[PDB]
Amino acid sequence: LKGGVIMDVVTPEQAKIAEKSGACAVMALESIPADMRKSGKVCRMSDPKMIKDIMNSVSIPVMAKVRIGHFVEAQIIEALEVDYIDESEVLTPADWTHHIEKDKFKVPFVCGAKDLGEALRRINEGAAMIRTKGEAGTGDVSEAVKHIRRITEEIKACQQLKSEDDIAKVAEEMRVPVSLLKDVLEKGKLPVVNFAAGGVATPADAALLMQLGCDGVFVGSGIFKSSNPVRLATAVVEATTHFDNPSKLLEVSSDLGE
Amino acid sequence: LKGGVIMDVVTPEQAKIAEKSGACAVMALESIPADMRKSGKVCRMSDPKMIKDIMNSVSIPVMAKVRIGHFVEAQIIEALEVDYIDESEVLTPADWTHHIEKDKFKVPFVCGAKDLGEALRRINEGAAMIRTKGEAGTGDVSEAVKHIRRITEEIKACQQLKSEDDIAKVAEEMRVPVSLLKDVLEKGKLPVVNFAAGGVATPADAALLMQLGCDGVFVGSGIFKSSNPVRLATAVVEATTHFDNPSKLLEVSSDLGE
Amino acid sequence: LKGGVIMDVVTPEQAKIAEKSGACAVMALESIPADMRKSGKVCRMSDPKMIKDIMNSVSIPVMAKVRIGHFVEAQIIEALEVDYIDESEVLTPADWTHHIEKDKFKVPFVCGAKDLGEALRRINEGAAMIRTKGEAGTGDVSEAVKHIRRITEEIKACQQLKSEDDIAKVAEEMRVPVSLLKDVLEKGKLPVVNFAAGGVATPADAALLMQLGCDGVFVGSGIFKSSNPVRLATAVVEATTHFDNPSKLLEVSSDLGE
Amino acid sequence: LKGGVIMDVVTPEQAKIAEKSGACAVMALESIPADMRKSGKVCRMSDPKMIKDIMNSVSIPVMAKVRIGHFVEAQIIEALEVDYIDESEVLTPADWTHHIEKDKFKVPFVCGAKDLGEALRRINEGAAMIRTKGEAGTGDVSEAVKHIRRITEEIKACQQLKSEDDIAKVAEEMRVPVSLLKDVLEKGKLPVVNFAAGGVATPADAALLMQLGCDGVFVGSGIFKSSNPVRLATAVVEATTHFDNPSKLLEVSSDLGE
Amino acid sequence: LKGGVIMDVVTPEQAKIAEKSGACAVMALESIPADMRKSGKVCRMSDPKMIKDIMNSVSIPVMAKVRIGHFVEAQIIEALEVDYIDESEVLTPADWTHHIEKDKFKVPFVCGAKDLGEALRRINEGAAMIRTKGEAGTGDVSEAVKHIRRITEEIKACQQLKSEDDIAKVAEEMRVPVSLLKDVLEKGKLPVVNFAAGGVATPADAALLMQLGCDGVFVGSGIFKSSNPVRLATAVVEATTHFDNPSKLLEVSSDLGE
Amino acid sequence: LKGGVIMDVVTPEQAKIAEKSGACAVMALESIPADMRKSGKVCRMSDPKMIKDIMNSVSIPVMAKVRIGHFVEAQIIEALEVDYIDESEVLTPADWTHHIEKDKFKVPFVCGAKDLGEALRRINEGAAMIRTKGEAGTGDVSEAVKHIRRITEEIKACQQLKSEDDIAKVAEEMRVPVSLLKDVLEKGKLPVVNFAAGGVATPADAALLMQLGCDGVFVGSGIFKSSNPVRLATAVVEATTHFDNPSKLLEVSSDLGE
Known part of the structure; x- marks a missing residue:
């Protein structure tokens, strides 16, 4: 799914709009925490029937x-x-x-992380995909940016550690195998794709996160609250694909509405 | 009562539904301590008459x-x-x-515990059944999970203890007899059935608690607030019974309604 | 002036009810003092006329x-x-x-106490009767239970002291003659009757306090807020008398209603 | 004015009721702090015209x-x-x-005090009369009682000081001349009449304060809020005069109303 | 402006009334900073036009x-x-x-001060007139009294200082030149007129502040909220003028209205 | 790109007004960001269409x-x-x-600063223009004044340092090249223009900031909430130009209305 956009969808028809906009995948869910977060209620797995109905509507x-x-x-x-399970901090x-012990499953998992230690713990439990923890609901892309910057800075700082012994002390504080930390230092990257999620509200935000090194980006139900969901969804996909083309980011951001 | 579901019921007709659904017992209570506790009221034993009418309604x-x-x-x-008395922290x-000095009664009691010490103190006093404390009324299964996991972990951590004198110190910190704590550690588990309670909302929750090693589960008046109590109650019973069978868990979870 | 039940009454008709239910005394009151503290109000002695009108209505x-x-x-x-004056912490x-210097009056006094020192100081000032303090208004029996248990437990612990100097040091911290504390330690009890008051709401509550060793129980206007007064007042009297008989406690507690 | 009652009056007609009830004096004032205290407003000297109108209505x-x-x-x-100025903590x-430097005036002043030092400072500034500071507005006589007890206890404690030098240290901490403190110790009383004020709501309260050694008592507008101001005012005067006659305090307290 | 009253005015017609009443100056302000400050608004210099219309209305x-x-x-x-500029802490x-560097202007300024240091700092910067700070808007004269009394006391307490070096230290703690503080101490008072302001509500208040040694008094929009502004304004002027004459103070205070 | 006035504008018509009043630039904005922070809302870049429509309306x-x-x-x-990009703390x-790494863009940037370090860090990152930060929204000029005074005062104090090592230690705490701090100390000023922004509400405020040494002044949509926009905008421009002429400042400030 690298280079791609995953969209939250709450109905089959939203999924079909996601798919026709260019999404690489969709994320099926009943609600969008939020309305429930400000309310108080427990967020749980969505009904399997509404999920299958979405799986039946797109390819x-x-x-x-x-x-x-x-x-x-x-x-x-x-x-x-x-196709993928998102062990999600948005739910309760x-x-x-x-x-969850993810290596006991066949299906791949994505997990969130706000820093290097967290990301390694999630991978060591068997996560196949990492995303930033962002700040979901708010439309403020700054938590996503903080977390991607933090992982990148931490990786770089570890790479300046000279002693194999200091490296081990770090693996220990992170509660992960030293081999895993060492593999990150040598590649200068997490060994799994890392997507931005949480606060990606505009095409600019999407292109921003890609320019900071994310392999793709999740977008929430904000797409569908907008006055033209197709235009906005297609614009975020273009922006994710042409993330380093200013004249095209300009073109897709123009006259988008509220 | 091993491997069963016990359901809170506030009327004879609720009790009958619990019984048709496959419940192994019912808990008669005149009103869930989650309505009035909000109002600031003393919650006491229910009227023996409403308990007796429930008792006359099911076998x-x-x-x-x-x-x-x-x-x-x-x-x-x-x-x-x-048949059983619940000395309950949900009441005032x-x-x-x-x-209560439970070993001076001839009816079995159940008591709550959030950790080992607590379980052993209740057992020492004569409890025949333990249940986690969790969070009554929220529908959040995480308090139940925390407590079962805490008890399991404390047993393991006490099992690591090399010195008989240190074991004895722990028993002393717990205010229970060493021979009781000793027997727990030899057996690797509590000497009575342990049920999950508080927060068990979906079939998935009930099966989660069983795969964590509970012997059964209490469910509250939430069954009876759902659009189809009969369907939800049956589904929780089937999930408690087939707690380690995913396809069956899928089937009972699909199209569950409000 | 032994055991039984004393009932708060606000009219001659309530007293008549208290008497025919089997109360051993009444406590004449012009208001229920929970109503008034809430207001902010000062609660004082009741108007002598209304006390007199109650005195006339019962024997x-x-x-x-x-x-x-x-x-x-x-x-x-x-x-x-x-017949008795209650120097009462429910009033302002x-x-x-x-x-008050009660040994200067001919009429006997009742006072409240939450622990052994307080009881001895009230007796030392001339109280003829102690009542446990309880939490008045709330219908919650646990404050009364706490105080009865406290007094008992303090007697038992003062009983462990082997040194007479230490016993004297206790008397002095309590501000009471050592001969008074010494008598309680020898006899295992206060030299006057001790009644439970505050939070005795149900027949079971009355009988609980008697089984804890109280000699009697004050009950508040809560009897008269109930759906059927004669019936609740008679049940409380019967439970106070038959405090040790489970099946009679069952019979009087059943179908008590609001 | 010793043995007497001073009443707050807000109109000439109230003054006439005060005078015909037995008051030794009246205190002219516009409001009764209160209604203004709970409001927020500055309390000041009353208009001279409303005062003269009261002075013109009684003798x-x-x-x-x-x-x-x-x-x-x-x-x-x-x-x-x-006739007297009350330098009053009720006003703002x-x-x-x-x-105020009271010795530069011909007219006598009364001042409040909550303890011995305060009372000596007020007398040393030239107060001709002391009253307890009470707790005005509330009808709770307990602050008045606290303050009279405190002055009495402090006087007694000073009287146990042996060293003339310690006595001086006390005068110093109080910021008064040692001769003034010494004059109090030798007489065992303040050198000026001391009246109770603040919280005197009933005839019993009035007789209480006299039995604790006050030379008289001020009563507030509470007299006039009652359903029969003449009966209540006459009853407080009788009670102040016959403060040690229980059968008469009984007679004047009976059937007083709200 | 010694021995005078300065009155806040918000219209030409208010200003005329102040002038007929005997005011020595008026203060033109578009709206008292006691209405909007409540709303949370920036209070600035008034519109020069409304100031000019006031200036055209009085001499x-x-x-x-x-x-x-x-x-x-x-x-x-x-x-x-x-004629004068008030650098005012009532404004934002x-x-x-x-x-402001007031000694660089050719119009005299007045500034607030709550103590000596503060007065001397404002004078050092070029203030030609000081006024107490007190509490604007409350009608409580005690803040004005506190500040005049604080300044008087600090002067006395600095006068006690024996060492020229200690005087110099005080001047330094004040951040003013020693020769200024020195001249204050030699003269026993501030080298410019000092006016009371904030809280001056009655004729009695104005005369109180004058007998404390103020050279005059500011009064606020409260004059114009009274039922008879002309009567109150005249009465404050007469009391400021005859500030040490009780019979005159009595006469102007009698029958003052709302 | 020197001094004058830059006005926030939300429509082409407001820009036209800004231009004909004599503004030297406009700042195109789709909302007033005080309205939105209050909401809770994320404030972002404005839609390129509306910026373009403003670009078309003025020269x-x-x-x-x-x-x-x-x-x-x-x-x-x-x-x-x-023409300029403002990297703005008013947005989220x-x-x-x-x-942003501004030295990588061809378009010049303006940034905010509240002190000398912040200004040097923004210049070091490539800012072409600094503006003081002020408090945007409030119309209160004191935050802008504070920041201009802060920067000035810090330059003056760094100027007192005699040691080059100490100057370097300052540069390093600021995180800027020592050659940059050294240039500011020698010249007594920032190497780029510095404008006041935030809280410039009145013509007097504009001229205040110019007299404090600013090279120009940003003004917010507050101009357009006023009763007469052309007139207020023209007054602010005139005051910015004639910042040193009292009588002209008087003329433009008079009869400005709401």
Whole structure:
């Protein structure tokens, strides 16, 4: 899915709009935390029936969310044959101590991370994909930027550690195998694709995150709240593809509406 | 009651539905302590008459709740011949320093615990069943998960202890007899059934708690707030029973409604 | 002046009900003091006329309250020839430093106590009767239970002291003659009757406090807010009398309604 | 005015009721702080015209209040020829550092005090009369009782000081001449009459304060808020006169109304 | 302006009334900073036109206010030829670190001070008149009293200082030249007129501040909220003038109305 | 690109007004950012169409804002060929750690600064223009005054340092090349123009900031909320030009109305 955009969709018809806009995948979900976050309610896995109905409407990959640590929700979502599971901090966590043991699943998982240690812990548990934790709901791209900058800075700082022994002390504080940390230092990158998520509101934001080194970007239901969802979704996809072409980012950002 | 679901019920007709659904017992209570607690009211044992009308309505075992330390509520419930007494922290505690001397009753009790010490203190006092404390009323399964996981971890961590004198110190910090803590450590688990309670909202939640090693689960008045109580109650029972079978978990979770 | 039940009454008709239910005394009151503290209001001695009108309506003993330290209220209530004066912390205290000098009155006094020192100081000042303090208004029995348990536990611990100098040092911290503390330690109990008050809402609550060793129980206007007064008042009296009989406790507690 | 009652009056007709009830004096004032205290407004000297109108309506002495430190209000009230000036903490203070220099006036002043040092400072500035500071507005007689007890205890404690040198240290901390403190110790009383004021709501309260050694008592507009002001005012006067006659305090307290 | 009253005025017609009443000057301001400050608004210099219409309406001196540090508001007011500029803390400060360099203007300024240091700093910067700060808008005269009394006391306490080097240290702590502080101490008072302001509500208040040694008094829009502005304004003027004559103070204070 | 006045404009018609009043540039904006922060809202780059429509309506230079760190917004606004880009703290910052690398753009940038370090860091990153930060929205000029005074005062104090090592230590704490700090110390000023922004509400405010040494002044949409826009905008321009002429400042400030 590298170079691509994943969109949150709440109905089959939204999925079809996502797919026709250029999305590489869709993320099926009932609500969009938010309306529930400001309310108080527990956020859980969405009904399998609404997910299958989305899977039946497009021919691109479909992802779905489960609660952090909720390995039973994950077993149900795997049995449904979705393409990816997003063990998501947007939903209400089920286990505040243990993430899901992802290497016991066939289906790939994406997890969030706000820094290097977090990202390595998620990968060491078996995450196949990392995304920034962003700041979901708000439309403020700055948390996404903070987290991508932080991982990049931390990687660079580790790379200046001379002692193999100091490196080990770091792996220890992160609670990951030294081999995993060492593999990151030698490649100067996480060993899995890293996508931006949380606060990506405009085409500019999308191109920003790509220019900071993200392999792609998730966008939320904000696309569909806008006065023309097709124009906005197509504009974010173009911007993600042509992320280093100012005249084209200019063209796709012009006259977008509210 | 191993491998079962116990359901809170506030009417004879609710109790009948629980029984048709496959519940192994019901808990008779005049009103969930999640409505009035908001208003600031003392929650006590229910009227023996409404407990008796529930008992007359089903042939599965009936439980009832008394306040913590309220051994006279318990004598009264015992004389009524309910099958189990729940000394419950959901009710307003009658004695904040002493729980009931349960080993002086001939009806079995269940008690809450959030960790090992707590479980062992309740067992020492004569509890025949333990249940996690979790968060009653929120529908958030994470408090139940925290407590089962805390108990499991404390057992493991006490199992690591080399010195008999240190084991004895732990028993002392717990205010229980060493021979009780010793027997827990030898067996690797609590000497009575342990049920999850508080926050168990979906079939997936019930199966999560069973795969964490609970022997069964309490569910609250939430069953009866759903559009189809019969469907939800049946689905929770089937998930508790087939707790390690994903395809079955998928099927009972699909098209679950409000 | 032994055990039984004393009921707060606000009219001659309530007293008549208290009497025919089997109360051993009444406590004449012009208002329920929960209503008024809420207001902000000062609660004082009741108007002598309304106390007198209650005195005329029943042949069992009548008590009335005065504010802590208000010895002129007590001079007036004594002249009225009530049977007991209750120097009561439910009223607004008149003197935060000095309780009334009760040994100067012919009429006997009841005072509240939350621990052993307080009880001995009230007895030392001439109280003829102690009541546990409880939490008045709330219908929550746990404050009464706390205080009865506190007093008991403090007697038991003072009983462990082997040195007479240490016993004297305890008496002195309590501000009471050592011969008074010494008598309690030898006999295992206060030298006057001790009643539970504050939060006795149900027949089970009355019988709980008697099983904890109280000699009797004050009950508030809560009896008269109930759906059926005679029936609740009679149940509380029966439970106070038969405090040790589970099946009778069951019978009087069933179908009590609001 | 010793043995007497001073009443607050807001109209000539109230003054006439005060006088016919037995008051030894009246205190002329526009408002009764309160309604203004809970509001926020500055309390000041009352209009001279409303004061003269009261002075013209009765033949007993009339007092009036000025703000603490407001020696100009005092000069205006003196020129009006009132009988006593009450430099009053009920009004909004004008000088938080300096009370009025009362010895530069012909008219006598009364001042409040909550303890011995305060009372000596007020007398040393030239106060001819002391009253307790009470807790005005509330009807709670307990602040009045606290303050009279405190002065009495402090006097007694000073009287146990052996060293003339320690006595001097005390005068120094109080900021008064040692001769003044010494005169109090030798007489065992303040050298001026001391009246209770603040919270005297009933005849019992009035008789209480007299039995604690006060030379008289001020009562507020509460008399006139009652359903029969004449009965209540006459009852407080009787009670102040017959302060040690229980059967008469009983008779005057009976059937008083709200 | 010694021995006079300066009155806040918001219209030409208010100004005329102040002038008939005997005011020595008026202060033109478009709206008292006690209405909007509540709303959270920036209060600035008034429109020069409304200041000019006031100036055209009376032949007594007209003052106007500028923000603290706003030397350009002051240049503008100066070009308008008002008679005095009030650099006022009632307005919203333009420069929280530097007041205006007043000795560079040719129109006299007045400035607030709450103590000596403050007065001397304002004088050093070129203020021709000082006024107490007190509490604008409350009608509480005690802040004005506190400040006049604080200044008087600090002068006395500095007069006690024996060492020229210690005097110099004080001047240094004040951030003013020693020769200025020295001249204050020799003369026993501030080298310019000092007026009371903020809280001056009654004739009695105005005379209080004069007997404390003020040279005159500012009164605010409160004159014009009274039922009879003409009567109140005249009465304050007469009391400022005859500030040490009780019978006259009595007469102007009698029958003053709302 | 020297001094004068830059006005925020939200429509082509406002720009036309800004131009004919004598503004030296406009700042194209689709909303007033005080309205939106209040909402909670993220403020971003404005839609290129509306900026373009403003560019078409006037022949004076047009600026637009981008979020701090949002270099892709700046890439887009540059492609649009606006005349200046303002990297603006009034918008929601995109990168809390890294301002844009402005020396990589051909279009010149304006940045905010509240002190000398911040100004040098923005210049070091390639800013062509500094503006003081002020408090935007409030109409209160004191934050702008504070920042202009701060920068000045810090230059003057760095000027006192006699040691080159100490000067280097200052540069390093500021995170800027020592040759940059050294140039400011020698010349007594920033090497680029410095404009006041934030809180410039009145003609007097504009002229105040110019007299404090600013080279120009940004003004907000506050001009357009006023009762007469042309007149207020022209007065601000005239005051910025004639900042040193009191009588002209008087003339343009008079009868400005709402």
